[PDB]
Amino acid sequence: KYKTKVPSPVVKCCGATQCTSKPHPDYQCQVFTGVYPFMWGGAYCFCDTENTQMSEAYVERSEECSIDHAKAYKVHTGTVQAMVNITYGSVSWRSADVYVNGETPAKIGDAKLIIGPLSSAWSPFDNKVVVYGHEVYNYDFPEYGTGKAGSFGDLQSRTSTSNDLYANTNLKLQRPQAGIVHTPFTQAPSGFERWK
Amino acid sequence: PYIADCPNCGHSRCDSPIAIEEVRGDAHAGVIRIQTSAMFGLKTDGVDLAYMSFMNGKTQKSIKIDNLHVRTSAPCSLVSHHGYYILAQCPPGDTVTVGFHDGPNRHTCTVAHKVEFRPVGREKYRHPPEHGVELPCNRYTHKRADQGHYVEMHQPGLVADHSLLSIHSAKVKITVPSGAQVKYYCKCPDVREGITSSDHTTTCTDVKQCRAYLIDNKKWVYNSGRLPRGEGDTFKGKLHVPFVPVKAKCIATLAPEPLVEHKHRTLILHLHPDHPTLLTTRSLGSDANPTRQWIERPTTVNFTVTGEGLEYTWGNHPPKRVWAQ
Amino acid sequence: QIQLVQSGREVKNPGETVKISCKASGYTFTEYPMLWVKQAPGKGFRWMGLIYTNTGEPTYAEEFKGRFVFSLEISASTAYLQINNLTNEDTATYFCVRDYFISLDYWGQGTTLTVSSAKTTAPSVYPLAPVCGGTTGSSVTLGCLVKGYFPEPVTLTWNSGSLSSGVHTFPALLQSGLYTLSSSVTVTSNTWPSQTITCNVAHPASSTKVDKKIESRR
Amino acid sequence: QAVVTQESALTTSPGETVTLTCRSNIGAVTSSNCANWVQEKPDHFFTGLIGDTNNRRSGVPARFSGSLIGDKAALTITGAQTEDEAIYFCALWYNNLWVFGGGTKLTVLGQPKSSPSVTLFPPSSEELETNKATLVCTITDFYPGVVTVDWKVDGTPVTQGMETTQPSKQSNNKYMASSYLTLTARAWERHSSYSCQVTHEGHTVEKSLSR
Numbered sequence: 001k002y003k004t005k006v007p008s009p010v011v012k013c014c015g016a017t018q019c020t021s022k023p024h025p026d027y028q029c030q031v032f033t034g035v036y037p038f039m040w041g042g043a044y045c046f047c048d049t050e051n052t053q054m055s056e057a058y059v060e061r062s063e064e065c066s067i068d069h070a071k072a073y074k075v076h077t078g079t080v081q082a083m084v085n086i087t088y089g090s091v092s093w094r095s096a097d098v099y100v101n102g103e104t105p106a107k108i109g110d111a112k113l114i115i116g117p118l119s120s121a122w123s124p125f126d127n128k129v130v131v132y133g134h135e136v137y138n139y140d141f142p143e144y145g146t147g148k149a150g151s152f153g154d155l156q157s158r159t160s161t162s163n164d165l166y167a168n169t170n171l172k173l174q175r176p177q178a179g180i181v182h183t184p185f186t187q188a189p190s191g192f193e194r195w196k
Numbered sequence: 197p198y199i200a201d202c203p204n205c206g207h208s209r210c211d212s213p214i215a216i217e218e219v220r221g222d223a224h225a226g227v228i229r230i231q232t233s234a235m236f237g238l239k240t241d242g243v244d245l246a247y248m249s250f251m252n253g254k255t256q257k258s259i260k261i262d263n264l265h266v267r268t269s270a271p272c273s274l275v276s277h278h279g280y281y282i283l284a285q286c287p288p289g290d291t292v293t294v295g296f297h298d299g300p301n302r303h304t305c306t307v308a309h310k311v312e313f314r315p316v317g318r319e320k321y322r323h324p325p326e327h328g329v330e331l332p333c334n335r336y337t338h339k340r341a342d343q344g345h346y347v348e349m350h351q352p353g354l355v356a357d358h359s360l361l362s363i364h365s366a367k368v369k370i371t372v373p374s375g376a377q378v379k380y381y382c383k384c385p386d387v388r389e390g391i392t393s394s395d396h397t398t399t400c401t402d403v404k405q406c407r408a409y410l411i412d413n414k415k416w417v418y419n420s421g422r423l424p425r426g427e428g429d430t431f432k433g434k435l436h437v438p439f440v441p442v443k444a445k446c447i448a449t450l451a452p453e454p455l456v457e458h459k460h461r462t463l464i465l466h467l468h469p470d471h472p473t474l475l476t477t478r479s480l481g482s483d484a485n486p487t488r489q490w491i492e493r494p495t496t497v498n499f500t501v502t503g504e505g506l507e508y509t510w511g512n513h514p515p516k517r518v519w520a521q
Numbered sequence: 522q523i524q525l526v527q528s529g530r531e532v533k534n535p536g537e538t539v540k541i542s543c544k545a546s547g548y549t550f551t552e553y554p555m556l557w558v559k560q561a562p563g564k565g566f567r568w569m570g571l572i573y574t575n576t577g578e579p580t581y582a583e584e585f586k587g588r589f590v591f592s593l594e595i596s597a598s599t600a601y602l603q604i605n606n607l608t609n610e611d612t613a614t615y616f617c618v619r620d621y622f623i624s625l626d627y628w629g630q631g632t633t634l635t636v637s638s639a640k641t642t643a644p645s646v647y648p649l650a651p652v653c654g655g656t657t658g659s660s661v662t663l664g665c666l667v668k669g670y671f672p673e674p675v676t677l678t679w680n681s682g683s684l685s686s687g688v689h690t691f692p693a694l695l696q697s698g699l700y701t702l703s704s705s706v707t708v709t710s711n712t713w714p715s716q717t718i719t720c721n722v723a724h725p726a727s728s729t730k731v732d733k734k735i736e737s738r739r
Numbered sequence: 740q741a742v743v744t745q746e747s748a749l750t751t752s753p754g755e756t757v758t759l760t761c762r763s764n765i766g767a768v769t770s771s772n773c774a775n776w777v778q779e780k781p782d783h784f785f786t787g788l789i790g791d792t793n794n795r796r797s798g799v800p801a802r803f804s805g806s807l808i809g810d811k812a813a814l815t816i817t818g819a820q821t822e823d824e825a826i827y828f829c830a831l832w833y834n835n836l837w838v839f840g841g842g843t844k845l846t847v848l849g850q851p852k853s854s855p856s857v858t859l860f861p862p863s864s865e866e867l868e869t870n871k872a873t874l875v876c877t878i879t880d881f882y883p884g885v886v887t888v889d890w891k892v893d894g895t896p897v898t899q900g901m902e903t904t905q906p907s908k909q910s911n912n913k914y915m916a917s918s919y920l921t922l923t924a925r926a927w928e929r930h931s932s933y934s935c936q937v938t939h940e941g942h943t944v945e946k947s948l949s950r
Contacts, residue, residue: 001222006421008353013407039424040199040211041356046383046405057421063345064222064441068334122482133332180209181201183421189310239791240773240832241623249771254740255834257771359765360740373740374568374836375583393584394740414580414835558839566777566828568837582836614783623791624775624830631783649860649875652948662858666875668866689879691917692907703917705858705877738861 001190002155002169003062006183010054011037013045017054024058026167028185036179043179053176057185059155059167066160070192071131072141072153077123086111130195150188152195198233198280198352199251200422202305212305213250217420219292221311225335225446226285226324227275228266228311229439230294233420235280236261245277245340248296254357254373254410263297265304268311278340278438280418288312288322317512318474319449320490328450329512335444344440349433352417353424354379354409361403368397368406379409451511461501461520463508468494473511480505523547525617525629532672532726534638538605541632543617545598551575555600556618556625557591571620572600609636635673642699644670646722646731649703653738661710663735665720667702670727678721679706741765743831745840751819752848759814759843761829767810768831774812775830776805779842781908788827789814821849824912852940853913855881859935859946862927872927876918876935876946881906884914887938892920893930 010017019029032053036043045051080100086109087093094109100116126138130152139152147153149170157165174184200215213234220229234250239258249258266272266282268289275283286292289311295304315321316333360378362369371394372378380390382400390407400406413426416433451473457464467475472492479485479502487499499506501520508516524546533539543555557569570581572591579591590603600617614631649664667675677690684706693702706718713735720733742764751757761774768774776789787796789805792812802818812831816823828842855878862872878886884906890897900921906914918935927950934947 003218005218005347008419008421008423008425010425010427037424038209038211039201039356041358041408044356044408046407062222063437064334066344067441067443068222181422181424182203185421239623240771240834241620241791243623243791251834252769252771253765253834255765255771256832257769258773258832259770371740372583373833374838375585376740376835377583377586378740412835556837560783565841566830566839568830568839580835616783616785618785618787621790622787622794622796623773624787624789624794625777626787626790626796628777628785628787631785633783645866645869647863647866647873649863651858652861654949662856662877664858664860664875664877666860666863666873668873689877689909689915691877691904691915694902694904696902696919701919703875703877703919705879705917707856 001062001064001192002059002167002187004057004169004171004185004187005060006055006057006185009056009181009183010052011035011045011181012052012054014047014050015052017052019054019056022056022058024060025165026059026169026171027056028058028171028173029054029056030173032175035176037176037181038179039181051179053181055173055176055183057171057173057183059165059169059171061155061157061160061165065155065157068133069160070152070195072144073129073131075123075125075127075129077121080116080118082115084113084115086113132196147191150191150194152191154188154191197235197249197251197256198417198420198423199355200233200420203308204306206302206304206306210305212303213252214294214296214303214305215420215422216292216294216305216307217418217422219307219309219311221286221288221292221309221313223335223441224314224316224333225444226287226313227336228272228284228286228292229336230266230282230284230292231280231418232282232294232305233280233418233422236277236282237279250296252298253359254355254412257298261296262299265295265297267293267295275336276338276340276439278342279435281438283336283338283439286311286313315446315449317449318476318509319451319470319511320472320474320492321449322471324447325449326447328448329514330445331448331512332443333446333448334441335446336439337442337444340438342438342440343436346434346436348419349416349435350419351413351426351429351431351433352415353426354411355424356408357410358403358408360410361406361408363403364396366401368401368403370395370397370406370408373410373412376414377411379411380407382406449512451513453513454508454510461503463499463501463506463518463520464496465499466494466496467491467510469511475511476509478507480507523619523627525619525627527617527629527632529676529725530633530635530674532635532637532639532674533607535607535609535636537607537636538603539607539634541602541604541615541634542594543600543602543629545600545617545619548619550595550598553619553621555591555593556620557600557602558616558618558628559613560616560631561613569602569615574600604634607634607636612636637672639671639698641727642669642671643727643729644668644675644700644702644722644724644731646720646733648720648733648735649705650735650738657710659710660707661713662705662707663713663718664703664705665722665733665735667704667722669699669701670724671699672726673700674725675700675702676723676725677702677704679704680717680719681721684708684718741831741833741838743829743838743840745827745829746843747841748844748846750846751816753819753821755819756815756817757819757845758808759816759827759829759845760808761812761814761831761840763811763831765833768807768812770807772812772831772833774805774807775837776803776812776814777828777830779826779828781825781912782910816845819845819847821847822912823847824849850882850912853880853882854942855879855886855937855939855944857935857937857944857946859933859948861933861948861950862922867924867927870924872922872924874920874922874933874935874948876920876937877915878917878937879909879915880911880913881915881939882913883940884908885939886916888916888918889936889938890918890920891932891934891936892922893932 096108202212272286384399386399903918
């Protein structure tokens with residue numbers, strides 16, 4: 001889930017402050033005029049329409065993104081394993097980890113054993129998978145870079161470290177009301193909020 | 197201790213020092229991490245986390261925490277404070293409603309935020325019990341020795357203070373806190389920047405047409421949305437967060453055991469939970485044929501078990517398994 | 522236990538710079554930052570700012586943001602005040618102070634600056650011995666007159682500082698564009714002139730050091 | 740941008756209880772102002788007494804306690820002593836800077852009076868070799884700290900040539916001062932009787948030299 005970690009808006013008191021499209025993820029910024037911002041002393045900007053307010057807000061990974069986070073995957077077939085016990089013959093023991101590919105031995109104990117390949121290639125994982133903590137979902141996640149806001153993957157970071165991401169959150173700033181300092185951020189709660 | 201604009205500050209939109217931003221009802225353990233714009237913790241100088249520094253005036257007031265109240269639909273329970281930030285064990289609530297008592301006044305602050313507490317588990321409780329299994333919840337720490345993240349905390353912008361703009365018996369008279377930087381002019385033409393000690397105003401007379409400002413950037417702030425930018429620069433002040441979300445194993449849920457009843461390749465199960473419990477199964481044939489249903493109302497259910505087996509998940513109670521030959 | 526000992530007092534003509542040191546003793550420098558206070562001749566006490574002896578960041582009072590610069594020889598437990606482009610109205614005494622216990626707990630001795638235009642004149646050191654006749658009491662008072670120097674300061678000791686009890690050193694005073702100072706010392710009548718008593722005077726600005734033994738007039 | 744105000748001077752007697760206050764121009768003083776009390780003894784000697792309203796610095800006698808009384812910070816000396824005679828300054832914190840009060844001069848009854856110790860020295864000879872002569876009159880250990888010094892060359896009140904310092908406080912809390920009478924090598928050799936007269940708490944002390 002996102003966090004609309006709003007940078008603190010500019011308030012020019014008499015005249016405009018043009019905004020620029022900073023490279024923050026989903027950097028929504030919209031200049032606003034026609035304010036009279038009550039801040040602790042009543043208003044403070046002495047004009048009345050030239051009072052300008054520039055709201056800016058970008059999307060950022062939550063602190064929970066590091067730890068409580070869904071996780072997509074493109075899943076191929078790989079190679080299956082097993083801790084095969086054989087309490088063999090009179091040997092009476094070997095508990096060894098093996099493979100399935102039909103030329104791999106595993107000389108753990110005394111016996112050499114070749115397994116598979118199995119005929120039952122049903123990977124219960126689908127091609128596309130989402131993963132969450134322990135509950136694994138064979139979900140057709142839309143993709144990195146695309147996820148519709150509100151839908152799953154509104155925030156899409158490659159990894160946790162990745163400062164870049166894709167944040168289609170439909171974050172739309174609105175003008176603050178009646179000459180008061182604040183930042184209307186109108187936004188879909190995450191497609192990670194739903195999906196839980 | 198920053199001061200911002202609380203939205204429904206008892207009456208209506210005041211400017212409380214405990215103005216609530218970044219409500220996070222995103223964990224599971226009945227807990228919310230909150231940021232006041234007020235920085236409680238140690239005093240102004242050096243002592244005792246359990247004291248209380250908010251802004252009164254331009255000034256702090258680093259005194260005792262005596263009667264804090266976070267609350268929601270019900271009164272919450274504090275967990276710990278550090279910096280601008282408090283952790284508190286709350287129930288669910290449509291809103292969040294915070295406030296201490298200075299002693300002369302209630303002086304609270306309140307806010308909207310959708311809160312819930314699902315515990316982790318297939319049981320949908322409303323509250324953590326005393327018993328049950330432990331399993332990997334998401335939750336915030338008690339502690340402060342914490343660096344797992346840090347939020348930008350650069351300077352404050354100016355602030356209004358019309359207590360400054362007195363009158364010099366005919367002219368409007370600005371003063372200064374301690375030699376702080378007061379940014380000044382009036383609608384008329386007079387002194388145009390203001391980086392001064394206590395000035396007068398030659399031209400204008402009315403207090404209501406002048407720039408009562410306080411560039412007082414000796415201490416940085418949280419970068420609240422309810423902050424005016426310090427226009428000069430992105431000063432330093434990268435500053436940690438205490439209450440990281442951690443992988444605590446909450447003391448957690450458990451649903452009452454089922455009543456297993458045999459039939460021919462069929463489990464009748466008279467069932468009777470405490471709370472809404474997500475039951476589900478997996479007929480282990482390559483035909484999965486699973487089932488899901490939250491059960492809060494006691495219900496006798498049925499499961500066509502096959503020859504090879506079925507499994508059965510009474511909430512976060514462990515999964516069962518069954519031979520029905 | 523805690524001693525903050527400051528540099529000695531300087532004289533500087535307008536426009537110059539000064540670096541005043543504060544050497545800290547008794548505490549761990551790093552857990553207690555430094556307050557710099559100006560007590561101006563008439564005006565009373567004023568906070569000039571505070572320096573975080575841990576990070577090194579200074580806070581200046583608004584009155585002091587500009588010509589004033591705090592710094593620290595961390596390594597030697599020293600904090601320093603530097604006042605650049607000295608203005609004549611900066612004559613005053615500056616104290617370093619330790620911030621602790623929700624206030625200030627220890628203050629230094631003070632370093633007094635006298636911003637003033639003037640050349641450099643070495644002092645004349647004159648012995649002051651008792652009147653030519655008699656002088657018979659249980660004790661005896663000798664003196665030392667340090668006349669006509671510029672600028673401040675001068676230091677004065679008696680017998681290299683081993684004789685400090687019974688000493689009165691009199692604050693320097695400006696007369697006809699020059700400073701004059703004096704000191705008296707009182708000892709038992711058996712000590713002098715039996716044992717040698719010597720006035721030690723230093724004037725750093727002129728690199729003048731004078732040792733003057735007090736001799737009997739006859 | 741705040742003004743701390745303190746009583747100007749207070750006089751008490753040994754054994755009494757005296758209260759000094761510290762008022763803030765912006766509002767009541769509160770615990771978040773962390774009132775500090777500092778004492779200045781003569782010689783630019785500073786020590787901290789109380790901090791954070793009521794924390795007594797270590798090694799400050801218990802007769803000293805701080806508190807908030809009404810809307811101001813207060814310092815109470817319970818059993819004031821003669822040694823407590825000094826200037827007390829209060830300091831208040833205001834979210835980002837400190838503001839010091841003007842200080843209160845406190846006077847405490849004690850220290851029995853003490854007469855001055857006067858000594859007059861003749862111009863040394865190395866100095867008469869400069870064509871100059873300076874008679875130094877030193878006055879130490881007097882209390883109360885106020886004196887009158889009058890010079891008299893040959894029976895006649897000198898009135899030009901003399902300079903008298905201001906009483907300076909010694910360590911024992913008594914005072915000192917010196918007066919200088921500068922003549923010329925020549926003025927020196929002319930007149931014959933010099934005398935430095937010091938008037939203190941009504942008695943007079945005359946120290947004369949004879950060339």
